[PDB]
Ligand binder design. Structure first.
Ligand SMILES: *[C@@H]1O[C@H](CO)[C@@H](O[C@@H]2O[C@H](CO)[C@@H](O)[C@H](O)[C@@H]2O)[C@H](O)[C@H]1NC(C)=O
Ligand code: NAG
Lengths: 49, 48
């Protein structure tokens, strides 16, 4: 629902949402976007689950 | 100015972004299930 959205707000008023109490499997974000930049800093995307 | 023991040439035609996908310690649909480079890769990639 956060990558299926249609009206990602502008940078001047960025929309922030909270995710909790669920199972995070990032294959969905991997296959939901033709990725151009995945520069993670705190945690490597590879073993992220 | 170098001497190499053995030299390997792996050839494959791919998309454009996957060229940047090809690098040691990377990830992607091609980098994870099609062609993963060694972490200590001693060599390089040529893309034209
Ligand atoms: C940021 O984008 C979110 C996309 O899911 C919005 O969450 C939804 O908001 C609707 C109301 O607009 C809720 O009914 C729904 O349950 C869900 O929480 C979120 O509102 C939005 N935030 C801003 C500030 O635009
Ligand atoms: C959600 O994503 C799918 C595929 O990317 C797309 O067809 C659909 O229109 C999207 N939904 C919304 C509400 O944009």
């Amino acid at each position: 629902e956060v990558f299926n959205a249609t009206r990602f707000a502008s940078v001047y008023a960025w929309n922030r949402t909270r995710i909790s109490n669920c199972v995070a499997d990032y294959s969905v974000l991997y296959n939901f976007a033709p990725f151009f930049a995945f520069k993670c800093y705190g945690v490597s995307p590879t073993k992220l689950n | 100015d170098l001497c190499f023991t053995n030299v390997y040439a792996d050839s494959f035609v791919i998309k454009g972004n996957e060229v940047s996908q090809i690098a040691p310690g990377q990830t992607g649909n091609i980098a994870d299930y099609n062609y993963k480079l060694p972490d200590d890769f001693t060599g390089c990639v040529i893309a034209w």
